Design a protein around this ligand. Structure first.
Ligand SMILES: *[C@@H]1O[C@H](CO)[C@@H](O[C@@H]2O[C@H](CO)[C@@H](O)[C@H](O)[C@H]2NC(C)=O)[C@H](O)[C@H]1NC(C)=O
Ligand SMILES: *[C@@H]1O[C@H](CO)[C@@H](O[C@@H]2O[C@H](CO)[C@@H](O)[C@H](O)[C@H]2NC(C)=O)[C@H](O)[C@H]1NC(C)=O
Ligand SMILES: *[C@@H]1O[C@H](CO)[C@@H](O[C@@H]2O[C@H](CO)[C@@H](O)[C@H](O)[C@H]2NC(C)=O)[C@H](O)[C@H]1NC(C)=O
Ligand SMILES: *[C@@H]1O[C@H](CO)[C@@H](O[C@@H]2O[C@H](CO)[C@@H](O)[C@H](O)[C@H]2NC(C)=O)[C@H](O)[C@H]1NC(C)=O
Ligand code: NAG
Ligand code: NAG
Ligand code: NAG
Ligand code: NAG
Lengths: 99, 50, 50, 49, 175
């Protein structure tokens, strides 16, 4: 709606019988595949991400943002605890570090 | 020519695959929108009588 | 040419076969007086922009 | 303004007004210096048509 | 078909020409509305799989494969259920600039991009995402935690399938 991509700002400038908008926008530059999982089963408990999605590089797992690859180690601050491992579909086995 | 629907693209849906950006681009685009049309009016004495 | 209006002296040149002058949108802007051969511009009695 | 709106009460704002406020009282005629009479007598009264 | 056609046209043609410019402006305005609604995104996408969207059946709203028309079954019912120069003394019907095939293709591209990529596809390069994780993000946007979704994925899938089946039966029956 406001330019093309994720919107940062728009600067208006006048024009004779018109207005021109300079839209500063955010565009994802490069792409990369990752393996993903909905939740992590640790100590018999299901862990769901508070913010971000789970990605995997090789065998090891991180949680990261949807719009930028900033891998952070999974922590009890990063994920919240709810449910059980049985009812969730697609859960993988991993560990949850705690500070 | 036939009207372009746009650039052709293909993405492979998967139940266990995600695509996360590694780099980002800050872009300035231009959108031009008309605001007003030049106001006109008619003089009735000139239009009818002259 | 019978009409009520204001007369104006203008620098408009007429060919000898052309007596009456019409402006754009067929109004009579200019006319050549018979007694004095000056070309006289025709302007409205009221400008009407009040 | 009252005449153009066609009402005694006029509300607040701008109103374009059209009316012959002038009403000129002067008539001028300018015809060329020709004053000799036309030969209508010859055409109408010719002995032979 | 009258005689002295040139004189009548010269005497009364620009009035009709102005009215025809008005009608042409109306027509190009309607084409502008069609492009305004059906052409948000120019990127065209295709959906290979049919039944891996977290148990959600999408056979009838997505365009079916192996048919010359890009039309879906629901859009088949939509075009089926609605019934439509000398004859009109010169009034003509201009065809739409966007034909129905590319309108169906635009809807197909919107559906394919939405299902494959969430909200991302219009921003730039399409980022693939599972449909269940997209539903988790939509629930998080609403305000309910995503843990409900993975606790009742089959229930929501069955409710969605039953709802679209009810819509199919409503549109198929005469009403
Ligand atoms: C994925 O990337 C992470 C982060 O770089 C790798 O984890 C590191 O691996 C090296 C070698 O195994 C260790 O020395 C570091 O201590 C690890 N750091 C972290 C943050 O875990 C991980 O090995 C990579 N996985 C693969 C092989 O793709
Ligand atoms: C994740 O770990 C759990 C246990 O921590 C695994 O559950 C075991 O699965 C084996 C294989 O059938 C059974 O013999 C055990 O009885 C299970 N143990 C428990 C406590 O349920 C589970 O299979 C692992 N998941 C994966 C994908 O490897
Ligand atoms: C993301 O893309 C930008 C391009 O805008 C990269 O910046 C370039 O980095 C190289 C290597 O240092 C420089 O030679 C170029 O001059 C940079 N470009 C500009 C416009 O300054 C950036 O390195 C990329 N980031 C990653 C992680 O790949
Ligand atoms: C999704 O729903 C459609 C219709 O609701 C299913 O299509 C049916 O398919 C079976 C064979 O699998 C046919 O016998 C039926 O006649 C079809 N129904 C109609 C209305 O044509 C489709 O199978 C469903 N998807 C899955 C994966 O089961
Ligand atoms: C992700 O995988 C698909 C299929 O293997 C491939 O076509 C695509 O190029 C990959 N993505 C990137 C960024 O390489
Ligand atoms: C994901 O899709 C693949 C491809 O068919 C399939 O083999 C696998 O069973 C699917 N997994 C889940 C959890 O749906
Ligand atoms: C008519 O006569 C006047 C003076 O008697 C003279 O100034 C004028 O030029 C004459 N006009 C013509 C057309 O003869
Ligand atoms: C026209 O000529 C006749 C004689 O043929 C004459 O009697 C008559 O009076 C003339 N008319 C005029 C205008 O004098």
């Amino acid at each position: 709606f406001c330019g093309k991509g994720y919107h940062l700002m728009s600067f208006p400038q006048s024009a004779p019988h018109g207005v021109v908008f300079l839209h500063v926008t955010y565009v994802p530059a490069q792409e990369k595949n990752f393996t993903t999982a909905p939740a992590i089963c640790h100590d018999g408990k299901a862990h769901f991400p508070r913010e971000g999605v789970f990605v995997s590089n090789g065998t090891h797992w991180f949680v990261t943002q949807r719009n930028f690859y900033e891998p952070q180690i999974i922590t009890t601050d990063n994920t919240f605890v709810s449910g059980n491992c049985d009812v969730v579909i697609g859960i993988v086995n991993n560990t949850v570090y705690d500070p | 020519y036939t009207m372009s629907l746009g650039a052709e693209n293909s993405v492979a849906y998967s139940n266990n695959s995600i695509a996360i950006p590694t780099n980002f681009t800050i872009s300035v685009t231009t959108e031009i929108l008309p605001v007003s049309m030049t106001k006109t009016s008619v003089d009735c004495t000139m239009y009818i009588c002259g | 040419l019978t009409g009520t209006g204001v007369l104006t002296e203008s620098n408009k040149k007429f060919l000898p076969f052309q007596q009456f002058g019409r402006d754009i949108a067929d109004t009579t802007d200019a006319v050549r007086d018979p007694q004095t051969l000056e070309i006289l511009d025709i302007t409205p009695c009221s400008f009407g922009g009040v | 303004t009252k005449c153009t709106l066609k009402s005694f009460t006029v509300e607040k704002g701008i109103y374009q007004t059209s009316n012959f406020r002038v009403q000129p009282t002067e008539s001028i005629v300018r015809f060329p210096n020709i004053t000799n009479l036309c030969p209508f007598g010859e055409v109408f009264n010719a002995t032979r048509f | 078909d009258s005689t002295e056609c040139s004189n009548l046209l010269l005497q009364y043609g620009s009035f009709c020409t102005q009215l025809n410019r008005a009608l042409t402006g109306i027509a190009v305005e309607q084409d502008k509305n069609t492009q305004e609604v059906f052409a948000q995104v120019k990127q065209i996408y295709k959906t290979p799989p049919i039944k891996d969207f977290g148990g959600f059946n999408f056979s009838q709203i997505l365009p079916d494969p192996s048919k010359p028309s890009k039309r879906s079954f629901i859009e088949d019912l939509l075009f089926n259920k609605v019934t439509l120069a000398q004859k009109f003394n010169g009034l003509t019907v201009l065809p739409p600039l966007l034909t129905d095939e590319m309108i169906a293709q635009y809807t197909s591209a919107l559906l394919a991009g939405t299902i494959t990529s969430g909200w991302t596809f219009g921003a730039g390069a399409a980022l693939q995402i599972p449909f269940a994780m997209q539903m988790a993000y939509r629930f998080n946007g609403i305000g309910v935690t995503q843990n409900v979704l993975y606790e009742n994925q089959k229930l929501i899938a069955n409710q969605f399938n039953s709802a679209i089946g009810k819509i199919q039966d409503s549109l198929s029956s005469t009403a």
